[model samples]
Target chain A: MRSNSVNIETFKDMLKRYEDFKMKNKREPRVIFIRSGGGESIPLETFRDMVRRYNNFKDRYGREPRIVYVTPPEPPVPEVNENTPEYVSITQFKDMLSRYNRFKEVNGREPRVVFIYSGGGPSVSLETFKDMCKRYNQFLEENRREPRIVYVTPPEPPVPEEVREMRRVLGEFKTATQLYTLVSRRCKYKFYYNDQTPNREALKKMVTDGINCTDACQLFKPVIEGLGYSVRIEHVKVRCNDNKWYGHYFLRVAGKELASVSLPSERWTVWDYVSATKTGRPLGAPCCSRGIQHLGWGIV
Target chain B: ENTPEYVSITQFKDMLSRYNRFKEVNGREPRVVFIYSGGGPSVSLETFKDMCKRYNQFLEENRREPRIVYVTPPEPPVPEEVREMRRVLGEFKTATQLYTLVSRRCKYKFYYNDQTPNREALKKMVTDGINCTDACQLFKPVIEGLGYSVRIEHVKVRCNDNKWYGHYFLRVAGKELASVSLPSERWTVWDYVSATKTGRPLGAPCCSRGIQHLGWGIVSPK
Candidate 1:
């Protein structure tokens, strides 16, 4: 435009189409910081920085500043980070890729995620995720900050918003004790902790379908244990069938015995400890009636 | 329903691998066997449905989150011999159910396990609906007549309201069955007995709230 007269074919068209341009994509196109002269990107949080630059350029010139939204050079890749809720070994991450590839092959779409990932660039579809992981792993092989956390959308038959919120709510607690306090009151104390990690589908269903008792101990077990506390699953023989004997399960942590049951009212049976009193039943209920059939399972 | 999307793809592969590993390891398809070890007494499927329905209804009626009334806990299988009695007594159940409507309400009879009263009297008494004590005593002969041993257990419970009561449930093969006395009003205990293979209610057991099960011991035939 600077080189020519404005009686012009290009300048006339630019004026006509200027207002219509931004509608063509998800967001307004702008010059991205160039690396190798093809740089691209900005996170929504910081994208304002670029917008300020773009508006300045537009005012200086007669029209929109343009360079077909650029692809920036290697921004620091967040391969994996310490803040992740969970992680897989590099080998395992690859295995999930293979599994997802097959999962996509078996079902047209990959399993959905309940949690959202809000970081820079287009939040990935599984295809891009596969590329991202591979690249991220190499970045790890080289060096890597903005962490991305993702978990598959829980299966269909959507969980109620409250149940899904339980994860977010529980995620705030930094210790097992803090987790157990809310979980004990809110989740009851059942042995079935529906873990997506271990096919806790039954527990998942129970929580989703609004089951009572069955405290979420097992559900939160790994998270608890992962936090560096102990989560012990204790199987004891109890009298049930018209007061005959059978094996029942409960969980024991630093001090309390956690179980979910409804009789005597829907409540958590927090035993004083391994050798003391339970909330409802006597401590001897598990201790003396019979010999140890089995003790607690989860360790460290 | 949409298929169960996996929790973690890595875990999914690992679990399916573990499942297949278990399947491969143990010559059978993998399935989990959880001991429903009495989070609370099991209830009848119908009662369970009622409980759930009531919860939702309560929620709907009140326009708030009503508490879940009851959920059916898992009922595991009892021993085979206990199962035999359940199967046999199940037949006795329908007949006693007939008694609740047809026979006279005799209040109860002083039937005791030691006294093997004539089958005819027990039949009539059961038809009329007897107490759990009389029913178990009355049930002994038929059970013994079927070539199995019978033992009576005392189900003593300490109430939340600071009271205690004891009821007798018949034990066979380390499992017990009760409520044959009335075989009606199947509360959590009787509903539990019904779920097991040991028995079903012949009628409703005598008056007892959902009892706080203290524990049991063989009261007779030790």
Candidate 2:
């Protein structure tokens, strides 16, 4: 779970590095990213960034990267409760090592993955985690291969109390190499706000409130970095009524990104954000939009 | 030196060759004589005459010039005939020369004195000459033509012994006296007699008493 800003410039840079490594070494590396189920808080911009990076890599290297979008169990439809073992037997975590090995064999190199928007209650059993690590390590030893796993957490609600506990445990366990804690104050209602005659200041305030959470983001910074990941912050700009406001926060690592925020539809496409601002048109209406955004091109 | 006795017809020509060798080495025809007899049925008189002529021709072919003699028993006197004529114009010999005593008043009524010719007297009436010596004489020339030196002996068998009372005939080969019923058991004993004389027993009842021992020579003692 690594994190990064889902921006075109970042993706283009990431792809250039990956392609350079493949061409120099004459070996293809497989990248698989697992998505977490966060209701309407999926990091769409970051995913779009990754897709752009992969597209760049494929265009240059003539090979496609392997990506798996896994959704941890959704909260029971009518129950609204967030904890259940039905969610615990999440396929995302089940047989993690085997999937890693398969990706490695297919792409002729070790597997590197970015886990997105996954954490909070229905925490994976410690035993299951240990088993996954053991299998992962065993596969590495047998194949003389190593996998790079990165867990990405978002900055929201000030890194919930239980997640803090898990942060300490992960630090002590030393399982993942890249743990990035990104921040996002994005709310469900403001992203859904419509300005039929909307207050311009109110909308601007809503967007700012969601973006400026430095203290909360800082608290998680050390915890995430302590778990062996190079942490970074990514401000996701939300455009509404022809005004660009950075309303969401996310994290990026080794160019792969994940965050928790009702992502803005204006960031639907890197091109959308650029074109709408340039043409003085609103790119997206306010609503809870959760998806991935791929951007791979020179920064405007 | 060449005689019918030396040229016996045999199933194996090798045996004939052996006989010929014996004749050549011994400088005389082989002294082997084959005796054959049975009393089941006799050929017709005409057939008997033809058989004798064939036998003479057989003797000539084998180059064996042995004398051919036939000793026939008296023609049976049963089945009384309606006499029309008595004709005889041939040289004939009588039994006196072949026997020490030729008894004329023979009370051996062949039908009644011995076991009757057949148990049913009518069969004996119809078939008057069904007796051992008579049958042997009828086939003697045929047997001789087959290169066997044959001999026929006629005897008067008395039925004083009740053991032979129901028997139709008897054959004496040394101490072995084979008796057969005149009518029913007659054929069985005839088989016994031929088997015994040939040193083989082909009789039934499949037991010791059914077969008679063929000894050194033929002897008829009361």
Candidate 3:
């Protein structure tokens, strides 16, 4: 079975152009990928796969990709009852932000792309999302450049009326252009092929058996890197085909233009996806079955 | 009973000098008595009484009625000659006041008397008679009589030339007194007097003599 996977040679040529552009501009492009999933443990395999791909990119480029992984902000409650599990959730979220701030200080530049990966359920509230956008705008003012957002998993459509109103408010607050339902065309087989000749049947079987968004993002990292772009993969909670919530993965290609991969099937505004999910008839293929419940994105 | 072998005038004066030195150094008269048995003039009961009178006079002159200990060898069965001495000692019990008769047997009793100080027992020792060798044992009641609390700090025994000798010191009002050894005839009365003054055992060579075996008691006041 033929897969419409990303062309390795074409991606490499594109990367050369991207690298040249960065050199000429004297700016290091960066990607900030935000994940939304409270207190979910990332699978070891998924983590290791991402690390392996990142190492590969670093080995070739002689420099690490400027990617910052972020999680949604938790409610800023002054005191939480320590006896409850919410204490741990709140603590983790705050710690994540502290680490994000430190990462930003070290990077000294704002990310060019912000990718939001929302899975089965919303990890943050609508209010938190707006708050995040406000923070992003502050980051934009400080950086003197606005970042574009890419929502990798599109929300289930047939929007609920209330959610439609929520999205309207979010749209007013978030002035940056958002690209939704922009899934990576690369898969695990592509990465495995770099080292050894993997059985085509086996690779095909793995994809047919269903690869989650995280594995897809990790597998596509090389393709993004080959195009001279740093990639950040974020883990988020999204509704899948089984109609159950699961942590999902998505990517932010640092230097790539959103229009370069534009397709009618791929494009959905943030409101379009949110409205679809609320109405209970969400847009996109892999995500439509499960639907996106929530998302958060900002400069980490 | 054999005749009571008494200390000589020379030994007595030597003891007086030691006692005076001890009083000078310690601000108190020595509480131990040096009863020499051998190499001294024999003393009769009349002589013993006279000496006690003189010793009391000496103490009175110094404004002290301190306890006194008599150091002698282990007494054999009461001989005819010493019978008078014992009778004399028995009669002057009250006059002797804080007098204690100590010998090797007395030291043995002291080493074995492991019982804690009992007021009733001590009172009995005073009213009745309790043969004790350790000076602290004799001093306990005397110091208590003088309104000072007494406690046995430590006791030690050693065997030299197949003879067991025991020594112990006392704590009076938390101030450590001196250790005393029985059978004071082994050295001059100065030795016994200075022993307590220097807080050492009787007959321990003097520090100034430069052949000093200066084992002494440690006194820590609270």
Best candidate according to TM-score: 1
Candidate 3 lDDT over A33-100, as tens digits, reads 11222233333223223344445566559876554122322322211100001011111223223334
Against the true structure, candidate 1 has what lDDT? 0.34
Off by over 4 Å in 3: A1-210, A240-244, A257-286, A293-300, B1-222
Strongest candidate by DockQ: 1
Worst 10 contiguous positions by lDDT, candidate 3 chain B = B179-188
Candidate 3 local Cα displacement, residue A266, angstroms:
15
Residues B1-222 of candidate 3 have per-residue lDDT tens digits of 111122223234444555566678999744332222111112222223334554555476778532221212112222221233333334222211222332211222223443424443334333433333334434433333332323332223343343333344433331122211111111111121123233344324212323311122322221
Which of candidates 1 and 2 reaches a greater DockQ? 1
Deviation in Å, model 1, residue B77 alpha carbon: 36
TM-score of each: 0.19, 0.13, 0.16
Root-mean-square deviation per candidate: 30.1, 64.9, 48.8
For candidate 2, write residues A38-134 as lDDT tens digits: 2222233333335545555665578755542323223211111111111111123323334344435554564223111121212222222343455
**CAPRI grade of model 3:** incorrect
DockQ of each: 0.02, 0.00, 0.00
Superposed by TM-score, candidate 1 places the C-alpha of residue B59 at a distance from the truth, in angstroms, of 50
Report the C-alpha displacement of residue A108, candidate 2, in angstroms. Answer: 25
**CA lDDT of every candidate:** 0.34, 0.28, 0.31
